[model samples]
Target: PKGTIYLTFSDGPVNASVEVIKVLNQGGVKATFYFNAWHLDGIGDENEDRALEALKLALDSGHIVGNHSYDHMIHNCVEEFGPTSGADCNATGNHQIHSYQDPVRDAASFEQNLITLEKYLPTIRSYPNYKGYELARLPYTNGWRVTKHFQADGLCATSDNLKPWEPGYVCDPANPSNSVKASIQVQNILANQGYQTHGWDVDWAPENWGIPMPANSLTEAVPFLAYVDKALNSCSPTTIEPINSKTQEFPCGTPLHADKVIVLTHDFLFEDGKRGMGATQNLPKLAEFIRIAKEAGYVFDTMDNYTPRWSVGKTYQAGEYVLYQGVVYKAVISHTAQQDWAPSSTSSLWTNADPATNWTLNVSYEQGDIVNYKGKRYLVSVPHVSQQDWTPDTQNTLFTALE
Candidate 1:
């Protein structure tokens, strides 16, 4: 009962993700995968030759899949400030700056990512753990748009004039660069489109960045567990030490988000490509981390369930109530929300607590059932399931006027 652990991996569906998925499956843990779509097409840029199979394993293993924005917004970098600026679309996100020049177009990359995902796994949406486009993580940014109440941004995630890997480069949150400002706007654009973008509370990064290629450079499982405990006690992310800043400086005990530690790691780090002994060294470490986290009473959950929200194109269970437009509306049946169906009695998906409740079909009615039909109050005379023809005014055998 130390805290909840959200083991999230980003920039994956890479060949190495297979081992990551296997580790979670062996540990009986369900984690989240933030994937880029280009890898599914055999794009070896990130050594994702087996990205398709890795994605399948992630979904089949019951782990959640989320969009990390296709190609990690590399195409954006090429389009906005690239090629001439020595930008390579095939390079990692850290190699470029000013990736979010056009926020709308940059945000659309999320949709593109899912579109590519569906092309590969036509039935991917059918998987209950397939988080689809609802959840996202901006490329090279630790920004949050989880909920209206719980929102934050990584002001120094990306730079304006300098690339992330450049020497003598440091981000000043107070004087954030133009690219970082655009990234913040991109998070807002996604929030308006009903996305719950999440950042991490802890990063499972390498201990050193030297030429050893991360061989045994990762923090061991037991100490990593202790670090998780420390994050909770020290009110981290502000106390966090990483290559860059997290989306927000949220303290511990932040309402519904309390005691939940979201651990961020990349699947590609476990692949032996441009790195040394990654699979042999990091995979076992990952498995041990899971074992230690569970032993410490840390349960795992996907980010979608972290803080459920009423979002367009998201499915809701029956009896789930959502606050919409300052009004509380309950789901009458299990259905998905649509752009037009913003929680109204007219839609079969939801019902409200208005003074006069409207009669709706697909609902069970009992004798003495009181409802308003066509602006008139009536009482049910017979127990029956409501139908389109059972109007309170016309179906006298089933309904009677209250007055």
Candidate 2:
């Protein structure tokens, strides 16, 4: 595969959610959806009475679910208000909103979000599709806390002294913490709680989230594909500009981090009416986007398996399977994987295995195992370990061709 793309949908389980899932299903693409439990309570503008149905559909259809904070950024406000309250709260209204400002409060927001979700989804913890309550996305901010090493804060994403759309509401590189310190603390709290949060590399957003009908009208499928390409092939913290000046390099040195692109988009963009645009135009664009991405050698998978199972101090034994980037490898020897000893296709510690394809050099062959070699399919007649020296044609008794 050329690269990996994790399409993560946020602020969903709305009316447009069904269409979003339908389009993804049509394209046979799996995506990650970070949900807000507020809709399940039947409150707010994004709410649809059918949110639970949409939630069930997503989980049933193999999509990964993540917590997007229960009340979103509303908890930052002094009191519970409408969905638009966060944007409305500020010096103008004399409201003291501290949603992501305090680490304790911000972390509580995440835990409360899961508590609400569990209320509706009693067995969400047991669902096979449910990765765990540990996965989450902070509301209204592009912050990250994937691990102690793999972490970043959205520097320019929030304002301390400025309000949204206010004059000079920009992040200063000289002072990254003016009002953004709380989000950083939130990231730390989530990490301490064993929660892994992810920030996106690309956004499938329109011009602005504040806009209604045309929220996603700024870009179409073709241009969106271009953005995906840019993120995958040529992107870095500096390249993806308007970010926090304090942002650091992503921790993982694996090719997966370099090639993997995480996309951010809201489900509200696919809505038909509330925004004054009746009927969905972005749905088709989404479908076409998936097609173009696939044609360009991109494979889509849910975020549950997004980052790949990696640990620095973990010990591995022979024949145990572990993931590096998107590839699965069987350990050739028992050893602890360190920062420098990460698994790779060419690494001596591991050998690649593709369940879809057969006949790798280092796999242990079983009697029932089938393989194709030299343009011919061969069946293993006896159990044996495979090696470079053992060609299928060399050992007639071991491998029999099925004509």
**Of the candidates shown, which would achieve the greatest lDDT relative to the real structure?**
1
**Collision count of model 1:** 1
Query: Cα deviation in Å at residue 273, candidate 1?
Result: 3.2
Q: Whole-model Cα lDDT per candidate?
A: 0.72, 0.69
Local lDDT at 217 for model 2: 67
Instruction: Give all TM-scores, in the order shown.
Output: 0.73, 0.71
Off by over 4 Å in 1: 79-96, 207-216, 248-252, 308-403
Which pairs of residues collide in model 2?
A: 76-99, 155-244
Per-residue lDDT of 263 in model 2:
85
C-alpha lDDT of residue 61 in model 1:
90
Error of 2 at 316 (Å): 9.2
Pairs of residues clashing in candidate 1: 142-247
